[PDB]
Amino acid sequence: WSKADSSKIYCHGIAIRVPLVVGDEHMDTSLALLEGFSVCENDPRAPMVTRQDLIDVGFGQKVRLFVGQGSVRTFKRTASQRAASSDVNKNVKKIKM
Amino acid sequence: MSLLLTIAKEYKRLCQDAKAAQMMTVGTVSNYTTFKKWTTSRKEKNPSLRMRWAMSSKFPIIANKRMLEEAQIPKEHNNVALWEDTEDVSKRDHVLASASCINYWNFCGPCVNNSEVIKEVYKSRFGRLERRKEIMWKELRFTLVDRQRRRVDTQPVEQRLRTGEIKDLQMWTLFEDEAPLASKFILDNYGLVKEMRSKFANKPLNKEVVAHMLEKQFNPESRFLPVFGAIRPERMELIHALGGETWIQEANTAGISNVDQRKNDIRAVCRKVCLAANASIMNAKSKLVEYIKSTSMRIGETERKLEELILETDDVSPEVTLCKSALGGQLGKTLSFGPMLLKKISGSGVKVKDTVYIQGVRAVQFEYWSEQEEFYGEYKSATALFSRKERSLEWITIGGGINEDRKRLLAMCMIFCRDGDYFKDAPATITMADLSTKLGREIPYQYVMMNWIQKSEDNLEALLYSRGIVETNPGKMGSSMGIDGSKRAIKSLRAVTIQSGKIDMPESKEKIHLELSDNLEAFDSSGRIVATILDLPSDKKVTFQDVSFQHP
Amino acid sequence: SKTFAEIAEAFLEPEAVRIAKEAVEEYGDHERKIIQIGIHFQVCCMFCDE
Amino acid sequence: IFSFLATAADFLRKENMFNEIFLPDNEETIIEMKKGKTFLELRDESVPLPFQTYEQMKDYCEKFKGNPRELASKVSQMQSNIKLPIKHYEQNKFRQIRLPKGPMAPYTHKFLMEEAWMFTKISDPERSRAGEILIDFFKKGNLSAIRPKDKPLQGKYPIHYKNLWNQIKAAIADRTMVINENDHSEFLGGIGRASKKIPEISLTQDVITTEGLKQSENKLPEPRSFPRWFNAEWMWAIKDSDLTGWVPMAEYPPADNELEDYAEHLNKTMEGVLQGTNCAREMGKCILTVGALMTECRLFPGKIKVVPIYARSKERKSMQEGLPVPSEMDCLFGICVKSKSHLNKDDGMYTIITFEFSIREPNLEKHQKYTVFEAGHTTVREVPLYLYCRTTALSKIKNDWLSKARRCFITTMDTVETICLRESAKAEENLVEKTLNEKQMWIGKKNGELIAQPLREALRVQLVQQFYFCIYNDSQLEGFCNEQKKILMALEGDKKNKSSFGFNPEGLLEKIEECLINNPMCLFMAQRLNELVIEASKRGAKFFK
Amino acid sequence: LQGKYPIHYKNLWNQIKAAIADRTMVINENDHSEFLGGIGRASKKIPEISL
Amino acid sequence: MEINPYLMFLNNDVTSLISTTYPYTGPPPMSTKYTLETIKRTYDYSRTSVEKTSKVFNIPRRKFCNCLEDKDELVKPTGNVDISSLLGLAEMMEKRMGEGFFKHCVMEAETEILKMHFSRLTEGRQTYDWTSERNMPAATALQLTVDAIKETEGPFKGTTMLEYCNKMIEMLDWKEIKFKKVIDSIKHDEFLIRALTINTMAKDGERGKLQRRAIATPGMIVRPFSKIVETVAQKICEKLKESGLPVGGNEKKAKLKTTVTSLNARMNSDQFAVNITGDNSKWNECQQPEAYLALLAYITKDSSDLMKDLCSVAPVLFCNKFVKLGQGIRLSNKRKTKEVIIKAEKMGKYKNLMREEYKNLFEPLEKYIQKDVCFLPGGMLMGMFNMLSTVLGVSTLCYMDEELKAKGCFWTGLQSSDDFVLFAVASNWSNIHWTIRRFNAVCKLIGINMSLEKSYGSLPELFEFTSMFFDGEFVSNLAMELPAFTTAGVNEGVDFTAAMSIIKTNMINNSLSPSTALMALRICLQEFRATYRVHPWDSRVKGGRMKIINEFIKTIENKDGLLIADGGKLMNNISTLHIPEEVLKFEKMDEQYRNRVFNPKNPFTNFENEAVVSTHSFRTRANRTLLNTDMRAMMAEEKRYQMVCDMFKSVFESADINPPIGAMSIGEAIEEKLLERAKMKRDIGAIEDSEYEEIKDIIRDAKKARLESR
RNA sequence: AGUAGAAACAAGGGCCUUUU
């Protein structure tokens, strides 16, 4: 592995993609936590914070935040490894019968 | 800080008004863009005359005021006027300044610690410079040139991307606080972003310029130009200094930019996986898609997913086409019949049935299209423009430079049009075994005759003989082709024209969404086939470097 | 671009695209509605979740 | 589910499709143009004649079927009631062009080229502005030695010109290139001869009847005849000028490959050949004088100024013998004066005045507008002296273009390099010097015979042609040069035995002869085109005598 | 850090690694080696009789 | 001796020297009489006299379509059309290209018209405002129209083109409209006439055809429908090969060459070909807007019911258009001392004190005339519809019949707007003539005439097309682009690189030779040095810019790294035209000078644009003539919008790069971001609780005021 | 006077709008 690409692991030549849930000494700028967060129903009770304090939250907690421009949402530090390909592909195969 | 407090005070003062409040309250933020146009609108017809007249004055420019005070810029050194306290009508916060004022700053003025960051901002042009410096020029000669027109790329670029994949990259490197939700391209390409971010961080810079330069660093400039010789971006960027219609400055530029190697490796991988999936009988489609998504490859330093590169390239090969079709990737209207290349110019038609007897009496169905249609065709170092009419090759013209290539192109064209008696009565040499179905997968008589030609040269000679031969009439001696591929003879083939000078490749900025079958044969809203697995080399062994075939 | 289907293919799976296309063809409605339907369909898929 | 929807909404908002149109509710599923009342009232009124409502037209177009037979019948019918004439040029030849008749077209260029006399001095790098050299030449006493008399050979208003010259000398003596507003200057500068406005609200019939206020009767230009002095100027502008470096030029960059070497060599040859002619000094004169005048008009409007007519050059290079490193020279041909160039708007006009020096008596036909005076004598021995004086005007556009008079070089270099490279490619060998020293280019007639000289010496003809195109440019010359191409294409077709044809050549000749009025260049080139077709009739058809 | 034709050397190193991977020490493509061998001297030649 | 420039055309070709004729080395040359003559010719070429009366305006309306009369001198122009033949030709073209063609194109267009924002109307040439009745740019006109809409009924919440079109439609049925001014209101009829109004401009920037001495300028109620029609026309034309309008340069050359090869390959031994160079006349005066309507209705027959209504707008609007008479006549006395000025609306009064020509040209057009406007119910104008006319024309080259084949005759070719090329084939001249007459007739049936003087023919390989003469080779005129090699007039950094790029493009396409390129480079360098009042250092010149140069020159080791605008020499050539000087000289520059030039904080620095940015990338002063004119009230709203935008940008730095998006307003985002930054700083950065609380109080007070004002 | 063209300029607003 290398500090340049901290998101890969090379074993016997094969490559492995490590998820981005936590950021250790090498990783950089809050781009290594995004695979640990996800969107959820908006809750005005949770606090509003920045993109740097986002690391001091607890797994499974909620927090409001500002995104891009003129947009606020609510995030939760819980991931979802599943994608839509399989779910669309498999579900469509169960309809041609 | 205090500046922040000032911004807050300004916002308050502005909200105290009614119109400003109404506009900052109504609608969304996008309205800003609109507001950006209704202001500062003024153009000029001939900026040249205006510029000369304008610069003639004694304080022709505008400039900031506080920047001058802070820069301790005076109004004279040895009696030359440098600026004067005043206000432009548009800005209202700028002051008219002299041309001499700029010179003053550069010669003696406010020095900065370092500026090598520029080399990264304009990396493309420093790369141009270096590529130039590593050339070994050669003699100059005069002669006529066969410059063919065609669409090509002039800017060498690594990791060519789309536009949506850039509008995001320009943020995570420069404006992260204002960043949007993380897109998939980011999560996938993390190291790339980290690299682009390591250089433009903690630096005094104008960011709009950086974003513009990044757009150029990721844009292959596609142009429709005349071209001669090899085709590589390293050359097209300076073609102006290599040769024209009457002159040529020889120079060797082969060992630079290592571009086409990536493309040939990609195509080899595509061929490999296509064959692998073809080994199947009922799920080659899903097998191929799995092989795709279960694979990656290295580009320079970074590791990229195959399916991502495939949707960025433009190599019109019978392999890349299939893959881009499986992934639902749209593409251009370009055909492929074996090794040759084809493109339709005009005409139409529809499928039709016919049969032929292989040996004695053995009926075998073969199809052919109905009304007249023009086609351009491109084989190795050879071009052609022909027409088909109801299972016949009406006419054809050629502008190549080789006899062998000419003959092969002509034969493949004759096949593509099912012209001749062989399609009416196949030869004895072929049999039911050579017919089709290596293991069950049928084969149209077209590719059958194709491989039958590629097998022996004498099959090709006989096929050419199938085309009418006559005596070379007077005058047309020059525009005639023998059996060997000679520009003139005493007896030549029928309905043929030759000439020196390639044909201008057509052009069309169109896209189509096609599909494919379980036998790996793509269709385009019609019974026409654009690609298949019979038009590619049979097989070959290669050792791929810096690749990841993460599949059992 | 050049068609709503190619657009929908940007962030949707081509399978659901074709599905909603066949559907609008069945009802013969304006093909600008490929998007909503595909979205609904994809939601249903990701709601099953196997 | 929420993540997918967020991504989709962001994408749509980026595509401007996040609206009811693409994302409607159950009810708002019928989008339609809000067809009002007035628009419909109009649409049912703009319909073609046979129909009277857009519905009928729509029903006729949506169901329209092709009936080729009626189409072919109408085609033939229209093809019979037309009778389009077809005229092969070989049978119907081109007559000669009929030039107008009347007096001769006189000199029109602001400055003199052949009749111009100049005083020269050596240039010092310190004193290089126009307001300085005009004084340097003034101290030696020749500029002040001049003293014209009240009796002019020709012209009008000589008293105004004389007083203006005296005031010019006085101002020069005062070291201030400025002039006061008197009656004379006011008359020569058109100061107060701008019309006075009269609103109609303040108008009445009695006022009209008092002083006739009819619609202005535009007095279009009047015709002229063929000028006989143009060939003289053309032949004079082909010879050397005793100096070079008349037109400033930049430096040559380095070179690394044979290509740049070839380019630099050829460019040096051509520039060295051209910088020695006479047309070149006129180009440099125009450049510098127009630059100075533009600067003045920009800085000192509403003020009568004094600007010289000068140029800078360098004496030719003899052998190493004698004095080496030849020096530079500042030459002065005359004086110029502006008048309140309040260029409020492009295309405007600011009157100027031209005081030039000559040693050649005038001609009434050619030097018609000038007002010459006998000044005195000057050396070389002593010779009499004349003072050509006139009045004219300019504008921003002519200034900018005259200042940009270094395009003729580009055009000529293009033509020459093209010819040479074409001749070199047909043989695959460096044939450039040979093509310049050997290839002959027909350049005129003398004693009824044709004349020829290598291209190396014919470049000057093309250069003068381009310069004149830049000088006498107008709408007339534009139309002419635009309508003459047909004749050249027909000629080429004749050379290659291509049976050309046309529909109405007489109309073409009419259109051509329509734009030939009081512009010497058009007349000269038209007469030369007639002579061309005549000389070619000895070798080609499609032309009448 | 200091050099003249870095790109040639780099591409040649990549080709060397590729060749070693192929278990053959040979290098088929001849673009960089040709250059770096001809930098010393390479040109055409005209016969004296054609002079 | 007598000297004739034209004798070189004997022992040499004509194309390789045709550039010598073009007088593009000098300045080119620059009402109501022209407009009146145009109106007259338009009403005349309508070879008929039928007329109706508009219930709306109560004005005579000559009907120019399927009403042909006066079949004499048909060689002359005619503006009458037979819709049947037009539809037949369109059907034949569709048949050639295949089915589902027009539908596919209109679909591709609708795919864009819907998502389009209504702010793309700011880009384009000037337009005619319908409030001040003058030609302003498009941005200001759109701004004023929106402001008027808002002040009348309410702000325009729309964000796309369709809503703007529907709003325009509704505004054509209102009864009282408001708008700002030093706040006049108007009625329905006046606003209608003032909207259909069209103005003229005498720009004609390009020389091209000297006959072109004007150009149209419609209002703002006709721009979006025109854009829709142009979009569909483009989507159609691009598919065709017999058109060269959108493409430029090498594309049409390749088209023509492939066409010639196909021709030479098709024709047998008993056939011969012919070429023609055509230049249609009165193009913008014979194209009728009714035939376009019928054609678009025939096209939009299988598509949705929405496009059928949009495309049908601009045609009827051009069928009921009004023209604007400019500046009226001028009166004067004999001595010309005094001078009276008069406008159009008054010419109807003093119609007796004018020249008999004006009287004969004016009195007939006195019923069609209204106040300083004329009701032109047909015809066309320049620049309005170019691609649609090209489509209508290409429909002819696709024609075929039984007679043409009974004789073994057929034609093809390639046409752009009012300029075409024809390739006829047959076995004998007697049939060539018949074929050409047939082509002329079929073109006459749709108002497409032909100029008999500017048009000529010859054997196959000799013709011209758009200033490009064609033979065995291709001759780049090379004078068409002569004005291009010049200082644009933008700044110092840029013009030089732009000129080098232009030279490169010429050398690549126009076959510009090397030495010519070098000469042009040196010339542009000299003009650059002269324009910006700058010169080198070793040069003897003494002056203002040059004084301090010689002063501080002592500090420099090598002068090879300097810039041209700072007393630098030229280091560039053919092999370095694709490289700006700022990049080529970077290694040479002495260290101190390099840091000062690229120091990022520079006062004048203001940011295709393939160039480097530096102190030399400045902006010019702004004009001040308006300072006197009372055009200031309009500056207020512009200043307001500018303040708003620059504040929003002060908060969000990427507003320009990345177009903002979201559901929030501006105030909401501003407030939230300010609070976020305040917290982010006060947590760690140099801020006190007092400052944070003061900021928060200010922000809440501003929010309260914003929400309370309205 | 003059320019140029098939009409416009020959200042306009209330004091303002110098180096090959």
Coordinates of C-alpha atoms in Angstrom, one line a residue, chain B residues 289-456:
Chain B
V289 CA -20.9 -8.0 -17.3
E290 CA -19.5 -9.9 -14.3
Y291 CA -16.1 -10.2 -15.9
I292 CA -16.3 -6.4 -16.5
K293 CA -17.3 -5.3 -13.0
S294 CA -14.9 -7.9 -11.5
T295 CA -11.9 -6.3 -13.2
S296 CA -9.7 -3.2 -12.9
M297 CA -6.4 -1.8 -14.4
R298 CA -3.7 0.7 -13.6
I299 CA -3.2 4.0 -15.4
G300 CA 0.1 5.6 -14.5
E301 CA -0.2 5.6 -10.8
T302 CA -3.9 5.2 -10.2
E303 CA -6.1 2.2 -10.4
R304 CA -9.3 2.6 -12.5
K305 CA -12.3 0.4 -13.0
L306 CA -12.6 -1.0 -16.5
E307 CA -16.2 -0.1 -17.1
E308 CA -15.3 3.5 -16.3
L309 CA -12.6 3.8 -18.9
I310 CA -14.7 2.0 -21.5
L311 CA -17.4 4.7 -21.3
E312 CA -14.7 7.5 -21.7
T313 CA -12.8 6.2 -24.8
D314 CA -13.8 6.4 -28.4
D315 CA -12.0 3.4 -30.0
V316 CA -14.4 2.1 -32.6
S317 CA -13.4 -1.6 -32.5
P318 CA -15.6 -4.7 -32.6
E319 CA -14.6 -5.4 -29.0
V320 CA -15.1 -2.0 -27.3
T321 CA -18.4 -1.8 -29.1
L322 CA -19.8 -5.0 -27.6
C323 CA -18.8 -4.0 -24.1
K324 CA -20.2 -0.4 -24.4
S325 CA -23.4 -2.1 -25.6
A326 CA -23.7 -4.5 -22.6
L327 CA -23.3 -1.5 -20.2
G328 CA -25.9 0.4 -22.1
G329 CA -23.3 2.9 -23.3
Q330 CA -24.4 4.9 -26.3
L331 CA -22.0 5.3 -29.2
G332 CA -21.6 6.5 -32.8
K333 CA -23.0 5.2 -36.1
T334 CA -19.9 3.3 -37.2
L335 CA -19.9 -0.3 -38.6
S336 CA -17.4 -3.1 -38.6
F337 CA -17.1 -6.0 -41.0
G338 CA -14.0 -8.0 -40.0
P339 CA -10.8 -6.0 -39.9
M340 CA -12.2 -3.3 -42.3
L341 CA -14.1 -0.2 -41.3
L342 CA -17.3 1.1 -42.8
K343 CA -19.7 4.0 -42.6
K344 CA -23.0 4.7 -44.4
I345 CA -23.4 8.0 -46.2
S346 CA -27.0 7.7 -47.6
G347 CA -29.6 5.2 -48.7
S348 CA -31.9 2.8 -47.0
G349 CA -33.3 -0.7 -47.3
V350 CA -34.6 -3.8 -45.5
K351 CA -33.6 -7.4 -45.0
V352 CA -34.5 -10.0 -47.7
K353 CA -34.0 -13.8 -47.9
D354 CA -32.1 -15.9 -50.4
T355 CA -30.5 -19.3 -50.5
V356 CA -27.4 -21.0 -51.9
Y357 CA -26.3 -24.6 -52.5
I358 CA -23.0 -25.5 -50.8
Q359 CA -22.2 -28.8 -52.4
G360 CA -24.5 -30.3 -55.0
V361 CA -27.8 -29.4 -53.4
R362 CA -27.6 -28.1 -49.9
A363 CA -29.9 -25.1 -49.3
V364 CA -28.5 -22.5 -46.9
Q365 CA -30.3 -19.2 -46.2
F366 CA -28.3 -15.9 -46.5
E367 CA -29.8 -12.4 -46.3
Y368 CA -29.2 -9.2 -48.3
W369 CA -30.6 -5.6 -48.2
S370 CA -33.0 -4.0 -50.9
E371 CA -32.6 -0.4 -52.3
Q372 CA -29.3 1.5 -53.4
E373 CA -27.0 2.7 -50.4
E374 CA -23.6 4.6 -50.5
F375 CA -20.7 3.5 -48.1
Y376 CA -17.3 4.8 -47.2
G377 CA -14.8 2.1 -46.3
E378 CA -11.4 2.2 -44.7
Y379 CA -8.8 -0.6 -44.6
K380 CA -5.1 -0.4 -43.7
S381 CA -3.6 2.5 -45.7
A382 CA -6.6 2.3 -48.2
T383 CA -9.9 4.1 -48.6
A384 CA -12.9 3.4 -50.8
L385 CA -16.3 4.8 -51.6
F386 CA -18.8 2.3 -53.1
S387 CA -22.5 1.7 -53.7
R388 CA -24.6 -1.4 -53.3
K389 CA -27.8 -2.1 -55.2
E390 CA -30.0 -5.2 -54.7
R391 CA -27.3 -7.8 -53.9
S392 CA -24.8 -6.2 -56.2
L393 CA -21.8 -3.8 -56.0
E394 CA -22.9 -1.1 -58.4
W395 CA -19.7 1.1 -58.4
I396 CA -16.6 1.7 -56.3
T397 CA -13.8 4.2 -56.3
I398 CA -10.5 3.8 -54.4
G399 CA -7.7 6.2 -53.3
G400 CA -5.3 4.0 -51.5
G401 CA -1.6 3.4 -51.9
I402 CA -1.1 -0.4 -51.9
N403 CA -2.1 -3.2 -54.2
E404 CA -2.6 -5.9 -51.5
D405 CA -4.6 -3.6 -49.3
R406 CA -6.6 -2.5 -52.3
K407 CA -7.4 -6.1 -53.3
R408 CA -8.4 -7.1 -49.7
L409 CA -10.6 -4.0 -49.3
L410 CA -12.3 -4.8 -52.7
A411 CA -12.9 -8.4 -51.7
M412 CA -14.3 -7.6 -48.3
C413 CA -16.6 -5.0 -50.0
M414 CA -17.8 -7.5 -52.6
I415 CA -18.6 -9.8 -49.7
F416 CA -20.4 -7.1 -47.7
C417 CA -22.6 -6.6 -50.7
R418 CA -23.1 -10.3 -51.5
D419 CA -22.0 -9.6 -55.1
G420 CA -21.1 -12.5 -57.3
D421 CA -22.2 -16.0 -58.2
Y422 CA -20.5 -17.6 -55.2
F423 CA -23.3 -16.3 -53.1
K424 CA -25.6 -17.9 -55.7
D425 CA -23.6 -21.1 -55.9
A426 CA -20.9 -21.6 -53.3
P427 CA -17.7 -23.5 -54.2
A428 CA -17.0 -27.2 -53.7
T429 CA -14.1 -26.6 -51.4
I430 CA -16.4 -25.4 -48.6
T431 CA -18.4 -28.1 -46.7
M432 CA -21.0 -28.4 -44.0
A433 CA -18.3 -28.6 -41.3
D434 CA -16.7 -25.3 -42.3
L435 CA -20.2 -24.0 -42.6
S436 CA -20.9 -23.0 -39.0
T437 CA -21.4 -24.2 -35.4
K438 CA -18.0 -24.8 -33.9
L439 CA -20.0 -25.9 -31.0
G440 CA -23.5 -25.0 -32.0
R441 CA -23.2 -21.3 -32.8
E442 CA -24.3 -20.7 -36.4
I443 CA -22.3 -18.6 -38.9
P444 CA -23.8 -16.6 -41.8
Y445 CA -22.2 -17.4 -45.2
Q446 CA -20.6 -13.9 -45.1
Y447 CA -18.0 -14.6 -42.5
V448 CA -17.7 -18.1 -43.9
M449 CA -16.4 -16.7 -47.2
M450 CA -14.4 -14.2 -45.2
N451 CA -12.3 -16.9 -43.4
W452 CA -12.2 -18.8 -46.7
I453 CA -10.5 -15.8 -48.3
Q454 CA -8.2 -15.2 -45.3
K455 CA -7.1 -18.9 -45.6
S456 CA -5.6 -18.8 -49.1

